[PDB]
Write a protein that binds this ligand. Structure first.
Ligand SMILES: [Zn+2]
Ligand SMILES: [Zn+2]
Ligand SMILES: [Zn+2]
Length: 178
């Protein structure tokens, strides 16, 4: 196994996957690492199994169809993995916890959003379709862009949204376009 957390790349109290060499802190893994279960497989392994059980799941999809899907177990897992993939980038730190807004010449967004709130929302099964989760994710970056305006800090939101969007297209097998 690895000696660092796959998500935050630090050492500490880790839990090791039984079917791959990754390891995780308890609350870096999503869902949080399960109390018992021996063996234990991590989210990367679970996602791989879904693909291997239904190879045609990797043929192209239209985003519109994906968004309308109900959050049944397999879609729930895929959104948890996509959330995880964002927390894997160190720039997610800017978007994790509840933000506040007091900048000369800007007003705060009408609907604040942050990653830990989405995490909690997924945990408490508050989204009924993929669209719900995707909307909150994109809201995070959109709020950031609107608030920071011409400050170069806006770029952080562009960069982390690019991470989200590449992973979204991969995990949900969105049809490749030019
Ligand atoms: Zn970690
Ligand atoms: Zn694994
Ligand atoms: Zn099949």
């Amino acid at each position: 196994n690895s000696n660092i957390c796959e998500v935050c790349n630090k050492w500490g109290r880790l839990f090791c996957c039984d079917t791959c060499p990754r390891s995780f802190h308890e609350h870096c893994h999503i869902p949080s690492v399960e109390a018992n279960k021996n063996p234990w497989s991590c989210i990367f392994c679970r996602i791989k199994t879904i693909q291997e059980r239904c190879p045609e799941s990797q043929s192209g999809h239209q985003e519109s169809e994906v968004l309308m899907r109900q959050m049944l177990p397999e879609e729930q897992l895929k959104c948890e993995f996509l959330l995880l993939k964002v927390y894997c980038d160190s720039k997610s730190c800017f978007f994790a916890s509840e933000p506040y807004y007091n900048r000369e010449g800007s007003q705060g967004p009408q609907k604040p959003m942050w990653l830990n709130k989405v995490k909690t929302s997924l945990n408490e099964q508050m989204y009924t379709r993929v669209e719900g989760f995707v909307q909150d994710m994109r809201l995070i970056f959109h709020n950031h862009k609107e608030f920071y305006r011409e400050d170069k800090f806006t770029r952080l939101g562009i960069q982390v949204q690019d991470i989200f969007e590449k992973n979204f297209r991969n995990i949900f097998a969105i049809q490749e376009t030019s």
